[PDB]
Design an enzyme around this catalytic site. Structure first.
Site, PDB file in Angstrom:
ATOM      1  N   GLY A  68      13.459 -31.484   4.840  1.00  0.00           N
ATOM      2  CA  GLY A  68      12.170 -30.982   5.532  1.00  0.00           C
ATOM      3  C   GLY A  68      10.879 -31.754   5.204  1.00  0.00           C
ATOM      4  N   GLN A  71       1.712 -32.621   4.085  1.00  0.00           N
ATOM      5  CA  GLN A  71       2.394 -33.647   3.150  1.00  0.00           C
ATOM      6  C   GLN A  71       2.200 -34.881   3.755  1.00  0.00           C
ATOM      7  OE1 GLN A  71       6.564 -31.761   3.167  1.00  0.00           O
ATOM      8  NE2 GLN A  71       6.193 -32.286   0.930  1.00  0.00           N
ATOM      9  N   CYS A  78      11.427 -31.340  -3.880  1.00  0.00           N
ATOM     10  CA  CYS A  78      10.245 -31.366  -2.826  1.00  0.00           C
ATOM     11  C   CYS A  78       9.912 -33.023  -3.027  1.00  0.00           C
ATOM     12  CB  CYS A  78       9.095 -30.521  -3.008  1.00  0.00           C
ATOM     13  SG  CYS A  78       7.749 -30.744  -2.155  1.00  0.00           S
ATOM     14  N   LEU A  79       9.531 -33.506  -1.731  1.00  0.00           N
ATOM     15  CA  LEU A  79       9.237 -34.721  -1.445  1.00  0.00           C
ATOM     16  C   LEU A  79       7.954 -35.054  -2.304  1.00  0.00           C
ATOM     17  CD1 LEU A  79      10.341 -35.464   1.995  1.00  0.00           C
ATOM     18  CD2 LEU A  79      11.867 -35.593  -0.284  1.00  0.00           C
ATOM     19  N   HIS A 124      10.331 -22.436   1.899  1.00  0.00           N
ATOM     20  CA  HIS A 124       9.614 -23.487   1.498  1.00  0.00           C
ATOM     21  C   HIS A 124       8.931 -24.188   2.131  1.00  0.00           C
ATOM     22  CE1 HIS A 124      10.135 -27.055  -1.505  1.00  0.00           C
ATOM     23  NE2 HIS A 124       9.534 -27.522  -0.288  1.00  0.00           N
ATOM     24  N   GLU A 125       9.089 -24.472   3.409  1.00  0.00           N
ATOM     25  CA  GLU A 125       8.390 -25.429   4.531  1.00  0.00           C
ATOM     26  C   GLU A 125       6.982 -24.728   4.937  1.00  0.00           C
ATOM     27  OE1 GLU A 125       8.287 -28.357   4.688  1.00  0.00           O
ATOM     28  OE2 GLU A 125      10.550 -28.236   3.885  1.00  0.00           O
ATOM     29  N   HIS A 180       4.035 -24.779   2.445  1.00  0.00           N
ATOM     30  CA  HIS A 180       3.059 -25.643   2.485  1.00  0.00           C
ATOM     31  C   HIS A 180       1.829 -25.577   3.369  1.00  0.00           C
ATOM     32  CE1 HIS A 180       5.328 -28.704   0.295  1.00  0.00           C
ATOM     33  NE2 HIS A 180       6.389 -28.594   1.268  1.00  0.00           N
TER      34      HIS A 180
HETATM   35 NI    NI Z   1       8.349 -29.751  -0.086  1.00  0.00          NI
END
Ligand code: NI
Length: 160
Positions: free
Chosen positions: A47, A52, A92-93, A134-135, A138
């Site tokens: 994702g 981000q 998470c990235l 989760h997305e 953000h």
């Molecule tokens: Ni994330």
């Protein structure tokens, strides 16, 4: 391939702006979508959200071939379908080197727009519901650390 922002950066804390209707259909947006896919695909991620990579917009992509169908979701809205919760792992990235247990709704409905402005309206469960939750966190300036309730399960990946 844009740079992914790391936790601590004040732009992962903005509430995101909605996608104005003029950009729906446009080449401008499609360029954004192709950059996001290009970026997410490169670092191997499941994702990405627009915040981000520096972009103040209500726009997330996600996909996995516990499979999740490839999706570009705009201006999203979430409705938990009941109170039942479920703990699983999340990475998470933006939070490199780490993993944590989070407890999310098991069942959700989500709504929003596709890249051309066609309405999306799905009810899902399990890993699919996790990823959407989760997305969309953000787009409201929340990262998974701010959701953990069991800090026994929070730590470095090469440890756990
Ligand atoms: Ni994330």
């Amino acid at each position: 391939i844009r740079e992914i922002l790391k936790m601590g950066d004040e732009r992962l804390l903005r509430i995101a702006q909605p996608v104005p209707s003029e950009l729906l259909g446009s080449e401008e947006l499609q360029r954004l979508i192709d950059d996001m896919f290009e970026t997410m695909h490169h670092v191997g991620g499941v994702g990405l959200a627009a915040p981000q990579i520096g972009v103040d917009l209500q726009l997330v992509i996600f996909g996995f071939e516990p499979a999740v169908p490839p999706t570009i979701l705009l201006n999203p809205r979430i409705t938990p379908l009941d109170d039942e919760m479920e703990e699983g792992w999340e990475g998470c990235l933006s939070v490199p080197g780490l993993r944590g247990a989070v407890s999310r709704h098991r069942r959700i409905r989500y709504q929003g727009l596709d890249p051309q402005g066609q309405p999306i309206d799905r009810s899902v469960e399990g890993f699919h519901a996790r990823v959407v939750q989760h997305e969309c966190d953000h787009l409201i300036g929340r990262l998974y650390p701010s959701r953990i309730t069991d800090f026994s399960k929070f730590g470095f990946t090469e440890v756990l």
